[PDB]
Amino acid sequence: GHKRGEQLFTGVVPILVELDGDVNGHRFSVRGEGEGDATNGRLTLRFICTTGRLPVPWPTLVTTLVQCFSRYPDHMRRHDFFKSAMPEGYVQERTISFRDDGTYRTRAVVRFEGNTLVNRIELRGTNFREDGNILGHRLEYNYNSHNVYITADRQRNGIRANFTIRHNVEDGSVQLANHYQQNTPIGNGPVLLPDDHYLSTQTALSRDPNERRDHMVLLEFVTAAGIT
Ligand SMILES: [Cu+2]
C-alpha cells in the first residue's frame, strides 16, 4: 500500500482536525483546518476552541492535534508506516502522563475523507491538580523541538512511539509530559513496519490578531532520521 500511500502526499493536502475532550469533567471541542506538504515535512494549521476557552493550555494538545506529513528521506522510504496505511488510515492512541499531575488518554482516527486528511480525536484527562501548571494555565505559549522515537509493533502490525515533551513553565521550570503511543492500521492491505528511527519535530505556535475565539496557529516541520 506504500506506493499508493506515497502518491496521496506528493502535493499539498487539506487537513481537518476534530477533537472532543473531557478534562477533570470539563468538556471542550477543538476544530482545526489547514494543509500538509509531506514532500517538505510541513504542516500549517489553525485551531479554534469551539466551546469557549480551552480548559488546558494549548501547548498540551499539540501532540494530540498527523505524522503521515513527516518528510521521510528517499533512503528511509521503506520505514514510513504512516503513509503506507493510507487512504484507509490508522488508529493513533496515547497515554500522556504529566509529571506530578494528571493524564490524557487519546484515541484518534487518521484517514482520508475524499481528498482531505482527517484527524478525529477523543481525549479524556483525569486526576489533574486544580492549581497545577495545566489547570492553572502556567505553561508558556511556545514549544520545544523533540525527537519521536519510533519502533515496530509486529504483533499489532503497527508502531509504538515513546518521547517526553518539555513544556516551558512561566516561572522558568519545565513541565514534563511522558508520551506512550501506539498506531494500528484500519485497512487489511500491507503496511511498512519500520526499523527503529526518530521523527525530528519542530513546532512554531502563533496567534491570529483578527480572531476573537480561543485559538492556536501552528506551523510544524517534521523529518525522519536515525537510519543511514
Ligand atoms: Cu505498500
From Swiss-Prot:
Result when mutating N147K: Increases fluorescence at warmer temperatures such as 37 degrees Celsius. In Esmerald; leads to brighter fluorescence. In VisGreen; leads to brighter fluorescence
PTM comment, free text: Contains a chromophore consisting of modified amino acid residues. Maturation of the chromophore requires nothing other than molecular oxygen.
Keyword field: Chromophore, Luminescence, Photoprotein
The keyword Ribosomal protein is annotated on this UniProt entry: no
Result when mutating T201Y: Gives rise to yellow-emission variants. In EYFP; leads to yellow fluorescence, folds faster and more efficiently at 37 degrees Celsius and has superior solubility and brightness
Result, substituting Y143A: In Cerulean; leads to improved quantum yield, a higher extinction coefficient and is 2.5-fold brighter than ECFP
Entry's Gene Ontology BP terms: bioluminescence; generation of precursor metabolites and energy
A Pfam family recorded for this sequence: GFP
Tissue: Photocytes.
Statement on biotechnological application from the UniProt entry: Green fluorescent protein has been engineered to produce a vast number of variously colored mutants, fusion proteins, and biosensors. Further generation of mutants led to more stable proteins (at 37 degrees Celsius for example) with brighter fluorescence and longer fluorescence lifetimes.
Effect in UniProt of substituting V148I: In Azurite; shifts the excitation and emission spectra to shorter wavelengths and increases quantum yields compared to BFP
Annotated phenotype, changing Q67L: In RSGFP4; increases fluorescence and shifts the major exitation peak to 489-490 nm
UniProt keyword annotation of Nucleotidyltransferase present: no
Consequence of changing F47L: In mut3.3; shifts fluorescence lifetime from 3.03 to 1.88 ns. In R10-3; matures to the red-emitting state with excitation and emission maxima at 555 and 585 nm, respectively
Phenotype for S70A: Increases fluorescence at warmer temperatures such as 37 degrees Celsius. In GFPmut 3; highly fluorescent mutant when excited at 488 nm
Effect ascribed to mutating I165T: In P11; increases fluorescence at 475 nm excitation and at warmer temperatures such as 37 degrees Celsius. In Esmerald; leads to brighter fluorescence. In VisGreen; leads to brighter fluorescence
Impact when changing S173G: In GFPA; leads to enhanced fluorescence at 37 degrees Celsius. In Venus; leads to yellow fluorescence, improved maturation and reduced environmental sensitivity
SUBUNIT field: Monomer.
Function description: Energy-transfer acceptor. Its role is to transduce the blue chemiluminescence of the protein aequorin into green fluorescent light by energy transfer. Fluoresces in vivo upon receiving energy from the Ca(2+)-activated photoprotein aequorin.
Similarity annotation: Belongs to the GFP family.
Protein name: Green fluorescent protein
Lineage of producing organism: Eukaryota, Metazoa, Cnidaria, Hydrozoa, Hydroidolina
Gene: GFP
